[model samples]
Target: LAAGAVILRRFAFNAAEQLIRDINDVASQSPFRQMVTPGGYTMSVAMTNCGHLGWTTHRQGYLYSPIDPQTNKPWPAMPQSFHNLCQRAATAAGYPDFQPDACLINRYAPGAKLSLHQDKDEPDLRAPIVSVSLGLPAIFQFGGLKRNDPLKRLLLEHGDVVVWGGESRLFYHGIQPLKAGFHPLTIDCRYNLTFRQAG
Candidate 1:
């Protein structure tokens, strides 16, 4: 995180269990799937979504679809708890009046990782990205707008929330490969909920 970005340590700690439960509930509806990137490579992390739009990738390109390709329906409704936490985190990070309609839920198994990339799919570039971490801790790589810029690594633990917007809205960021680990709630995986104002 840089200027206009902040890490609210353990901001959602009390709600972590309910968040996980809601994630499982959402998965039951949309189900997590490994999407293939436009370049023909399958993502290592499994993904699902809740709310008005869901992130997806096809041979054609990346998109935010109102319907889940797997289930052919709108993604599961965002849990009230999710919305509550997201708004609170965003406000705490100095982004007040934030209203996100998309929650992209990603599941990372051991060795699964995401390469540094900017999040540019949303229609509202001014809205902040609110990301919540849970289960096994992971190293989060945050860099400047350029992919090759010097990176800052931070340990993201369960219930930690990071919000980036304004000047740092287009920063390149990703997670390092997850190490083998166990947590009381998720057992063998890490879960991330990224809230965005996408329509």
Candidate 2:
């Protein structure tokens, strides 16, 4: 929580059901998979995507691709419902013209965690990054522009939406290891949908 970063608590509660359905549909078309970083470490989070471009990492590097390397086809189209929700969240966060062309979906099981990093792969840094949290809750680390800058830990619960851009766009952020929990909608997992304008 800082300048250009806004957390819309439970902002997606009303559309949670539709969002879950859309996530399932997108995953069905492009199944989730754990990816390896350039350093050769496998990420704990399983990821998929649905949009014009999909983010991916390998031993070589991380970049956006129109084709799913595993399937040799384009990722699923971003559902209209998903697009609308992201736009609404972005607008609420003071980014009325945000247009996301990439939606990276991450699935985290108990013990899964993401390392602190900046979302710099996107070419359009002006557009805010809109993220939606679903199912289980997790502690989201929001840091300053520097990697070791002071950080704030915020518990992001189901249906929570976070949008950040402008001065906070390149802030280092990540998720702490997910704690064991059960949710009616996702059982024991947490799902995150991150919308961005990559191309």
Candidate 3:
């Protein structure tokens, strides 16, 4: 939440149903599974991916690849709903030509905390990041470009969409520890879909 969203960049209110359905469909093909960071700690957030590029972590480090290491196959295709939704958000956020090639989905169970970090892993730095939140609420921490910069905590809920680009693209951002809760729309976890141009 910046000074003022002024206009609701929220996607079509009716878009949730299709969004959820598409998420499930994608996961069925690339089942959600846990991954390990290069540092050796197993992540609390389970992940699955779709689109032309997908991201994962392992001893090799954090990187986007065309294949899902789990299935050793190309990740599922990015549902048309997903691609269009991302483009709409990006366009509203000032990136008219946004074309995301990676849709990395995360399932956050309670206690799945994301430490502050910048999204420097994507190969296309000029592209913005569009994210949609589904399920329980969480506190989103948006920080400055520098590691030690001040942070602003945002209350994010199901149906919320975030667009980061321009001067804010490289800002350090993450979710604070998640709290246990259940949203009828989601399983026991909060589902976050992040769209990026990773190729």
Candidate 4:
């Protein structure tokens, strides 16, 4: 379903069994670690990535780089399955030619939450963000361009997809604290995959 230019609920990976395993393997290779924000604050959620570029934040700034500063090596190459899934889902969400250079994989445990923020690190704002939710459910907070604008809450479950583009590209969004729960597959965790056109 779509609201204006923002597309939501575009189904894909309904039976994400093998896909989940692949993601888990990739996570093991890179491992999720808490990242400090540019403001010197440590993020509660753990994150890792598999792509040509990885999104990172530190005292310097928020940006996408080809190498992981910690390891001084390029991030793991994006798996073909993951690349195909994102492209296919993006196309279904009205971005037929989407080619994301960065993928941010976030792991949210109970009590871990993402604060509201805008994704403006990428040089190209014309491309949409394709986000996929898996494992335990969580409340997604969607707000307007202004920080104080009235926000809408949506429950995002496994396999759900949310695409933000056009006028909504710079809108603020975040996840509420996840409650304690054990998903059959997630085993008390939630995973969020965000694809972006970052250099």
> Candidate 2: global Cα-lDDT?
0.91
Task: Encode model 2's per-residue lDDT on 1-199: one tens digit a residue.
Answer: 5787888999999989899999999988899999888988889999999999999986668899999988888999999989999988988887788888899999999999998998888887877888899999999988887877998889999999988767778888899999998999999999999998999
Cα RMSD for predicted model 4: 1.8
Residues 1-199 of candidate 3: C-alpha lDDT, one tens digit per residue: 4531212334634577788899899998899988988988887788999998898986767898899999998999999988887777777767788888899998899889888888889877767788888888889887776899889888778878887766677778899888998788786778888898887
Residues 27-135, candidate 4: write the lDDT tens digits: 7777788998877788989998888999988677888888887777788888777788788788777789889888899999999999899999988889888888888
- Local accuracy by lDDT, each model: 0.91, 0.91, 0.82, 0.82
TM-score of each: 0.97, 0.96, 0.92, 0.93
Regarding lDDT, does 1 or 4 come out ahead?
1
Give the Å shift of residue 6 in candidate 2: 1.4
- Scored against the true structure, residue 148 in model 4 reaches a CA lDDT of 99
Off by over 4 Å in 4: 1-10
lDDT score for candidate 4 against the true structure = 0.82
Q: Put the candidates in TM-score order, highest first.
A: 1, 2, 4, 3
> What residue pairs are clashing in model 4?
none
User: Which TM-score value belongs to model 4?
Assistant: 0.93
* Candidate 1 segments whose C-alpha is farther than 4 A from its true place: none
- Displacement of residue 72 (Cα, Å) in model 4 is 2.2
Deviation of model 1 at 175, angstroms? 0.7
Higher-scoring candidate on lDDT, 2 or 4: 2
- lDDT for 29 in candidate 1 is 91
lDDT of 3 at 157: 83
